[PDB]
Assembly symmetry: D2
Homo-oligomer: 170 residues x 4
């Protein structure tokens, strides 16, 4: 999957974050071996040597840890709708629908503007190396039997998700 500007989004890292959350829950659910399985899957997804992780980096964003980078894991849309008289807006939305049919992203944004609709793209990002470290260290803590401490690191990984919301400039 790609952003509106055609930058690649990591589905593997998205699934890894899903696995991290499920792993943390299973620690409290009395299923620590399931938690290890889920964290192990997240580790494999984030460290896949056949994946070119450069493809997912958001270059213009400084990560908290030196030498790390944020990668894109999801994109969503926020619309903001101005008030328009019902007739004028129905007409402009019809033109927006044509541009979406045609695959014309720029034309869609422009037609939506005529409909009183602004578009914001919300890019969900994680720091790649910091998240990798959380997962591998959490598994090590699970190996040692320090399950609560592992859960803290899995929560830390989730709390490292940020959302860059940016106006659409195509």
């Amino acid at each position: 999957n790609v952003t509106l500007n055609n930058d690649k989004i990591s589905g593997q890292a998205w699934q890894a974050m899903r696995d991290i959350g499920m792993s943390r829950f299973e620690l409290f659910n009395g299923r620590t071996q399931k938690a290890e399985q889920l964290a192990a899957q997240a580790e494999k997804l984030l460290n896949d040597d056949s994946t070119d992780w450069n493809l997912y980096v958001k270059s213009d964003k400084k990560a908290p840890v030196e030498g790390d980078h944020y990668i894109r894991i999801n994109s969503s849309i926020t619309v903001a709708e101005d008030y328009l008289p019902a007739g004028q807006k129905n007409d402009a939305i019809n033109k927006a629908n044509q541009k979406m049919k045609e695959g014309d992203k720029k034309g869609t944004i422009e037609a939506l503007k005529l409909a009183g609709v602004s578009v914001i793209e919300n890019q969900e990002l994680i720091p790649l190396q910091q998240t990798r470290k959380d997962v591998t260290t959490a598994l090590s803590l699970m190996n040692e039997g320090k399950y609560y401490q592992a859960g803290l690191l899995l929560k830390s990984a989730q709390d490292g998700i940020v959302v860059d919301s940016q106006s659409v400039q195509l």
Copy 2:
């Protein structure tokens, strides 16, 4: 997957909500045929006749639409940590770790209480029939070329996600 009280959670409906969000994004991304594919997958997941949807219902919660029910699609944990002197807390967390190792959910909650830690379970829920209607109607709108209107219904489905946060009573 199951809640702390061993009530079943619908992984199919969780994936359907993920598909609904991706479908909405692809409308704005100029990929309406991909959006239809994703919404069609969500429709199949939510309407699987081999699934016993009764297994996922949260009975004690009134859905907005008459005759509908909320179903569980995810569970997560929130902890609240009281301040304790470092030594006393390390000791109580060690006992909590033993109870998690043993699969003893009740014992884990009790040991965590001694560590100054309260546990809340956050159950993510959707209204099943209302969400089904949003998806099927969105696909129909996509068939008609009314892509923006379809996106509104997909957003409505996402906005119907609620989170029941409850103290753990095992």
Copy 3:
């Protein structure tokens, strides 16, 4: 302020939570004396002896700590809009607008249903005694110079905010 069912909402406790968040920020901002001022204000708001805290309790919700209760601190609305043909919906929204003008909450919900609109009320709640303890203990830690530990307790108080989203039954 009151909920749709006319149950009282604590504006003092809402402001206390706002103060708790600002206090935590000021610890990291190198303004620990400002952080203490803000936490002291939150403590005074949550422990106001002239306030009848019973008025804000949500009775049907078990708090994590024995003998505690959740209180209401905010209410908001989520709407879910079904697809309707433009003309039929404009007509039903006009009737909904009349019922809101008249102060007729039940009539508003019913007219909105005819417009394809379901209404959910989101009640923001905090555990009163647990939050009080977090604030007073955080101030004590600030007095001792243990600012990071105080920040952890202020964050814990914020993480204790839950949102009960319920269908409107007037």
Copy 4:
């Protein structure tokens, strides 16, 4: 109030957003005249001619509407805690506490790094002119009796809140 980098944050615009949310709720609560009062207060706060709105602008962020700018309305902190042996971390947190006592923001971030703690600052932003337009147009709709349409614009204003989460570079 100021960010970690000493950029000013608009408390007036924060209160305006709070008023916008309360105004929307009161429309559904059958208190449209209270909703107008709250929206009128938000309008006065956002359009205060004695306020130098330049002080709050985040210059490096393109707003969706041409000629508009994002302004800062809140700052919060996210910490990410690496696993450290209890003794080593207690010692590093003690040094972090000293730097916060001294008002040394840079020193606090550095000491926290030694404790395994990274710091992210979350800046809540709104587009100033777009939000002003939502409020003034919502009041006009309320004057006309179009309360549901006003509520849509108030929700749009709230949905325009974005959170810029950035690594701390002092």
